[PDB]
Each structure stands twice: as structure tokens, then as C-alpha cells.
Amino acid sequence: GASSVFLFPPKPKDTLMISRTPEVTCVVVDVSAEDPEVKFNWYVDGVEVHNAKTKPREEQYNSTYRVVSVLTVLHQDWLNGKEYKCKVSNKALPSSIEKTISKAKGQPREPQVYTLPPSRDELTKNQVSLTCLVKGFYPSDIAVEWESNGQPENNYKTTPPVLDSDGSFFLYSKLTVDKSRWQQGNVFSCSVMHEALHNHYTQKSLSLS
Amino acid sequence: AGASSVFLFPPKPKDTLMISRTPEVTCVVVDVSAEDPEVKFNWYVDGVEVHNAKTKPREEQYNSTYRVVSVLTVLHQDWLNGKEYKCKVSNKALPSSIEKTISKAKGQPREPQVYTLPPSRDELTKNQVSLTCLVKGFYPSDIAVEWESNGQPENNYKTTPPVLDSDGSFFLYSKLTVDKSRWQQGNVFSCSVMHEALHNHYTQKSLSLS
Ligand SMILES: *[C@@H]1O[C@H](CO[C@@H]2O[C@@H](C)[C@@H](O)[C@@H](O)[C@@H]2O)[C@@H](O[C@@H]2O[C@H](CO)[C@@H](O[C@@H]3O[C@H](CO[C@H]4O[C@H](CO)[C@@H](O)[C@H](O)[C@@H]4O[C@@H]4O[C@H](CO)[C@@H](O[C@@H]5O[C@H](CO)[C@H](O)[C@H](O)[C@H]5O)[C@H](O)[C@H]4NC(C)=O)[C@@H](O)[C@H](O[C@H]4O[C@H](CO)[C@@H](O)[C@H](O)[C@@H]4O[C@@H]4O[C@H](CO)[C@@H](O)[C@H](O)[C@H]4NC(C)=O)[C@@H]3O)[C@H](O)[C@H]2NC(C)=O)[C@H](O)[C@H]1NC(C)=O
Ligand SMILES: *[C@@H]1O[C@H](CO[C@@H]2O[C@@H](C)[C@@H](O)[C@@H](O)[C@@H]2O)[C@@H](O[C@@H]2O[C@H](CO)[C@@H](O[C@@H]3O[C@H](CO[C@H]4O[C@H](CO)[C@@H](O)[C@H](O)[C@@H]4O[C@@H]4O[C@H](CO)[C@@H](O[C@@H]5O[C@H](CO)[C@H](O)[C@H](O)[C@H]5O)[C@H](O)[C@H]4NC(C)=O)[C@@H](O)[C@H](O[C@H]4O[C@H](CO)[C@@H](O)[C@H](O)[C@@H]4O[C@@H]4O[C@H](CO)[C@@H](O)[C@H](O)[C@H]4NC(C)=O)[C@@H]3O)[C@H](O)[C@H]2NC(C)=O)[C@H](O)[C@H]1NC(C)=O
Numbered sequence: 001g002a003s004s005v006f007l008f009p010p011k012p013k014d015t016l017m018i019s020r021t022p023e024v025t026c027v028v029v030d031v032s033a034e035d036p037e038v039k040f041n042w043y044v045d046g047v048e049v050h051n052a053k054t055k056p057r058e059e060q061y062n063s064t065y066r067v068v069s070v071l072t073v074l075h076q077d078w079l080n081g082k083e084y085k086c087k088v089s090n091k092a093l094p095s096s097i098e099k100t101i102s103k104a105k106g107q108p109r110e111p112q113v114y115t116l117p118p119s120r121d122e123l124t125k126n127q128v129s130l131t132c133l134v135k136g137f138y139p140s141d142i143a144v145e146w147e148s149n150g151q152p153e154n155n156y157k158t159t160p161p162v163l164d165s166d167g168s169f170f171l172y173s174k175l176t177v178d179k180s181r182w183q184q185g186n187v188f189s190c191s192v193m194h195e196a197l198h199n200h201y202t203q204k205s206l207s208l209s
Numbered sequence: 210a211g212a213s214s215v216f217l218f219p220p221k222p223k224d225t226l227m228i229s230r231t232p233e234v235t236c237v238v239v240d241v242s243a244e245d246p247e248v249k250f251n252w253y254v255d256g257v258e259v260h261n262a263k264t265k266p267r268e269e270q271y272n273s274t275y276r277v278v279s280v281l282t283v284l285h286q287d288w289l290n291g292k293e294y295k296c297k298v299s300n301k302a303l304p305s306s307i308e309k310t311i312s313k314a315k316g317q318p319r320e321p322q323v324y325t326l327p328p329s330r331d332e333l334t335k336n337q338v339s340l341t342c343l344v345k346g347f348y349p350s351d352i353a354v355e356w357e358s359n360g361q362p363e364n365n366y367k368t369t370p371p372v373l374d375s376d377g378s379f380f381l382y383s384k385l386t387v388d389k390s391r392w393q394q395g396n397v398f399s400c401s402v403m404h405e406a407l408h409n410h411y412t413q414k415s416l417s418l419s
Contacts, residue, residue: 114331119343129324131341133339160370165365170367174343
């Protein structure tokens with residue numbers, strides 16, 4: 001079952017902040033109740049490692065079992081482009097199944113962050129859209145958040161990264177707020193974390209002009 | 210049993226929304242063996258067999274298999290009214306036929322609101338600047354967005370995929386990049402949006418230096 005095994009990268013924020021602990025996560029589903037202990041082998045740049053913490057089989061709501069293995073990774077290892085391999089050996093199956101993941105290769109490029117106030121035409125509405133354009137970044141791993149008065153905002157959506165014509169990525173984040181909060185002069189801030197920004201962080205603000 | 214080797218693709222949104230354009234449904238069969246006899250296609254529209262499809266000759270792939278494509282031209286009205294298109298792929302080498310079906314997304318259509326946004330003040334120090342088109346509140350997600358200036362298509366734009374918003378509708382952004390000099394001259398730029406819930410399937414918003 002080369003499709004019962006899933007390997008997840010660390011969160012973008014986790015690899016960029018010293019206070020956080022990035023992990024790669026190997027998930028195997030559909031283990032039968034009659035199957036023996038599923039084995040995980042982990043490799044970093046081809047070298048086997050043994051510090052993974054594997055979760056005892058958890059019974060599911062569809063009668064199957066799930067096994068999750070978690071490997072903590074070093075911030076710099078991930079950022080320096082090391083390859084993480086997860087190999088899952090379920091003896092009830094013919095074959096072991098391997099997956100590999102790593103940071104995309106290529107010169108990192110610094111995001112340029114721009115905030116855009118609502119379109120004049122939208123000011124007629126009950127709620128208005130505050131836009132954060134983030135462009136020119138590489139690789140596509142990035143975190144974007146909105147806040148106001150030191151507090152996280154409740155209502156925003158961010159597009160996936162989109163490949164631009166010069167080989168870098170862009171995205172937009174759309175924050176929706178009541179027109180009243182906008183008219184009252186509240187300051188809103190889009191913060192962005194990416195490996196190619198100084199301090200891995202930058203913020204741009206937006207308020208009624 | 211070959212079931213995962215047949216793929217059925219819808220027409221492009223723009224093609225279904227403009228009568229002058231030709232919308233097509235495309236049935237693609239991959240992993241066709243050289244030892245297989247002729248792959249055969251039958252096509253149906255709401256269960257009724259149709260005969261106007263054009264099937265291309267098999268094309269050799271670098272992995273020693275063939276790809277075979279059949280293309281069915283559809284009426285705009287038919288697609289937009291939700292008729293079902295079925296491609297049935299037959300091959301003596303297989304025990305059973307493989308059938309795939311496709312149709313337009315269901316659910317109440319909602320009209321997009323289109324907003325143009327000028328470059329951020331901070332971007333005006335760059336030699337290239339970004340003109341933004343925000344399109345929101347639409348359903349279904351099938352939509353086309355383009356940019357023009359002086360009646361000519363612009364080259365350098367990219368558009369995000371539709372993103373599901375908190376109310377069940379979709380939004381996207383389209384980003385047009387232009388030389389800062391063209392923006393500063395006062396040239397007018399237009400974002401045009403095609404969607405089935407718009408009057409005449411078309412609307413546009415313009416943007417220039419202010
Ligand atoms: C029996 O039950 C279990 C449990 O199911 C759950 O419970 C029931 C009640 C249902 O409600 C069900 O919906 C629930 O999911 C079933 O197990 C499930 O099995 C399916 C497959 O059958 C799995 O589906 C795949 O999911 C992938 C993504 O999963 C994530 O996102 C979904 C939501 O989108 C979540 O629900 C998942 O749990 C996953 O969530 C992610 O989890 C990560 C690990 O924890 C998180 O990362 C970590 O987070 C921590 C802290 O949070 C740290 O930060 C760590 O650092 C970090 O690593 C992550 O944040 C989290 N994300 C989110 C958003 O929450 C899909 O990607 C995948 O699609 C691929 O594969 C498909 C083939 O199956 C294919 O169709 C797709 O196209 C895609 O294909 C891939 O394409 C790429 C590139 O093109 C290729 O490179 C790949 O090769 C290719 N894939 C291939 C070849 O396989 C699947 O859709 C599902 O995840 C799983 N659930 C759980 C919980 O394990 C089981 O199936 C049931 N049996 C039945 C029904 O018979
Ligand atoms: C041997 O080789 C062949 C050929 O590959 C090529 O050669 C080899 C040697 C390599 O060099 C390789 O790199 C080359 O590409 C291999 O054939 C491939 O087989 C795989 C399957 O194994 C196919 O994978 C599916 O791809 C779908 C997307 O395909 C499009 O997008 C890719 C780019 O991302 C293109 O490469 C494709 O050609 C398709 O491109 C589209 O083509 C349309 C038809 O022409 C275009 O539409 C038309 O456009 C014209 C204009 O030109 C008009 O506008 C018409 O009106 C319009 O109709 C369209 O524009 C174009 N798009 C793009 C972006 O280019 C995926 O959708 C699909 O995913 C489904 O299936 C998976 C299961 O396999 C599943 O995991 C997914 O989740 C998803 O599941 C489906 O989900 C839907 C709903 O979401 C359900 O309804 C379905 O039921 C469900 N199906 C399931 C579960 O099965 C696959 O990933 C691949 O497309 C194909 N390549 C080619 C070129 O045909 C072959 O595999 C090799 N064999 C071996 C043994 O190695």
C-alpha cells in the first residue's frame with residue numbers, strides 16, 4: 001500500500017523560531033487489527049537515526065489502526081536542505097514503503113510585503129477587505145498572520161503560494177473586518193515569517209488614511 | 210482494472226461562457242499497452258449516445274506505453290444546464306469497460322464582486338509594480354480572469370486558484386505586473402472577469418494612476 005503512508009514536513013514557523021521544535025511526521029493508516037508491530041526506519045541524508053518517537057497503534061472509528069511516528073529535526077538541518085526518509089515495514093504486506101521530504105532547492109529570495117487598503121468601491125459594504133500581498137519569495141515555505149492592537153484577527157484567508165513568471169512565489173492574504181473598525185482608525189498588521197527575511201520576520205501595517 | 214488509467218477533463222470556464230469559443234470535454238486513456246488491441250470510446254450525454262467526438266491516434270510515451278485521447282465538443286447551454294457527460298473506454302484486453310462521468314459543479318450560483326487595487330505606496334520604489342484584482346463572493350469556483358490595456362491583452366499576470374471563503378463562496382486574486390513607468394504615465398488597465406452568474410457572463414473594472 002504505497003498510498004497508506006504519509007510524510008509531513010515541519011511547520012514553516014517551527015523551522016524559523018528558536019523557541020519552537022520542528023518535526024517531520026510519518027503517518028501510516030489502514031493497519032489491520034491482525035497485523036503485527038509496524039516498524040519505522042528513519043534516515044537523515046541516508047544515515048539511519050533512532051531518536052524518532054513512535055506512537056503505539058491507535059484504533060480508529062472505521063475499525064482500522066493508525067500509527068504515527070514523529071521525528072524532531074534540527075532547525076538548521078531542515079534549512080540547510082537535508083533529506084528526511086521514512087520507511088514503513090508492515091510484515092502483512094509484500095513491500096516496505098519509503099517516502100522522502102526536504103526543503104526545496106534553489107537560492108532563497110526575500111519576500112516583499114505590501115498591504116493594500118479596501119477598494120473605494122468596497123467601502124459601501126458592511127465588511128471590507130484588507131489585503132496583504134507577499135511576493136518574490138523562495139522557497140515557498142512561509143507563514144502569514146494578521147493582528148490588531150496586539151491581538152490576532154478572527155477572519156482571514158490566505159491563498160496558496162503561486163509560481164510567478166520569474167521563478168519566485170507570491171500569495172495574498174485577505175483579512176475581513178467590519179467597516180466600522182476600519183473607519184475608527186484601527187491599525188491592522190500583516191506579519192510574515194520566511195527564512196530569507198532578516199530575523200526571519202517582518203510586519204507591515206495598514207490603517208485608514 | 211484500468212479504472213485508474215482513464216481521466217476525464219471538463220471544458221475551460223472561459224470556453225463555456227463565450228459562445229464564440231469551443232468548449233470540449235476530453236477523455237484521456239494512459240498506460241495503453243502495445244500488445245492491446247484498439248482502444249474504443251463511446252460518449253453519452255445524459256445517458257444518450259452521441260457520435261460527434263474526435264479521437265486522436267495513439268501517441269507513444271517514453272515509458273513504452275501509449276496515450277489515447279478522445280475530444281467531445283459540447284454545447285455551452287448544455288454544460289451550463291448541468292448535463293452529464295460520460296466517456297466509456299473499451300478494450301478487448303480488459304474484462305470490463307471503464308466509464309467516467311463529469312458535469313458542472315452544482316449548487317446555487319453567486320455573482321462575484323470585482324475590486325481593483327493600486328500598488329502599495331511602498332512598492333512605488335520598484336521598477337515593476339503590482340496591480341491587483343480581487344474577485345470575491347462567487348459560486349461555483351469556475352471562473353476566468355484576464356487583464357487588458359488599450360484593448361490589448363497584458364502579458365505578465367498570474368492568478369491565484371479559487372480559495373474557499375468563510376461563507377461558502379470563493380475568492381481569488383489576480384496580480385498584473387507592469388513597468389512602473391507605464392503606471393506613472395496614466396495608462397489605464399482593466400481586469401475582466403467571466404463567470405456564469407454575471408450578466409452576459411462578463412464584467413470588468415479599470416485601474417489607473419490617481
Ligand atoms: C479510517 O480512519 C482513518 C482516520 O481518518 C479520519 O477519521 C475519519 C472519522 C474521517 O473523518 C477521515 O476523514 C479522517 O481523516 C483514515 O485515515 C486517513 O486516510 C486518508 C487516506 O485514505 C488520509 O488522506 C490523506 O491525507 C493527506 C493530508 O492529510 C492531512 O490533512 C488532512 C486534512 O486535509 C488531515 O485530516 C490529516 O490528518 C493530515 O493532517 C495533517 O497531519 C500532519 C501530521 O500530524 C500535520 O503535520 C504535523 O503537525 C504537527 C502538529 O500539528 C507538527 O506541526 C508537525 O511538524 C507536522 O509535521 C498537518 O498539520 C496536518 N494538516 C492539516 C491540514 O490538518 C493528503 O495529502 C493525501 O492526499 C495525497 O494522497 C492521496 C492518495 O491517498 C491523493 O489522492 C492526493 O492527490 C495526494 O497525492 C499525493 O500527491 C503528492 C504531490 O502531488 C505526491 O508527492 C504524493 O506521492 C501523492 N500521494 C500518494 C502517492 O499517496 C490523502 O488524502 C488521511 O490523512 C488519514 N487520516 C488520518 C487522521 O490519518 C483511514 O483512511 C480510514 N479508512 C477508511 C475510511 O477506509
Ligand atoms: C507513462 O507516461 C504517461 C505519460 O506521462 C508523460 O510521459 C512520462 C513518460 C513522463 O515523462 C511524464 O512526466 C509525462 O507526463 C503517464 O500518464 C500519466 O498518468 C497519470 C496517472 O498515473 C496521470 O495523472 C493524473 O493527472 C491528472 C491531471 O492531468 C492533467 O494535468 C497534468 C499536469 O499536472 C498533465 O500532465 C495532464 O496531461 C493533464 O493535463 C490536462 O489535460 C487536459 C486534457 O487534454 C486539459 O484539458 C483540456 O484542455 C484543452 C486545451 O489544451 C481544452 O481546454 C479542453 O477543453 C480541456 O478538456 C488540461 O488543460 C490539462 N491540464 C494541465 C494542468 O495541463 C490528475 O487529475 C489525476 O489525479 C486524479 O487521479 C489520481 C489517481 O491516479 C488521484 O490520486 C487524484 O487525487 C485524482 O483523483 C481523481 O479525482 C477526481 C476528482 O478530483 C475524480 O473525479 C476521479 O475519479 C479521480 N481519479 C482517480 C481516483 O483515479 C492524475 O494524477 C497523468 O495525467 C498522465 N499524464 C499524461 C500526460 O496523460 C503514465 O502514468 C506513465 N505510466 C507509467 C506506468 O509510468
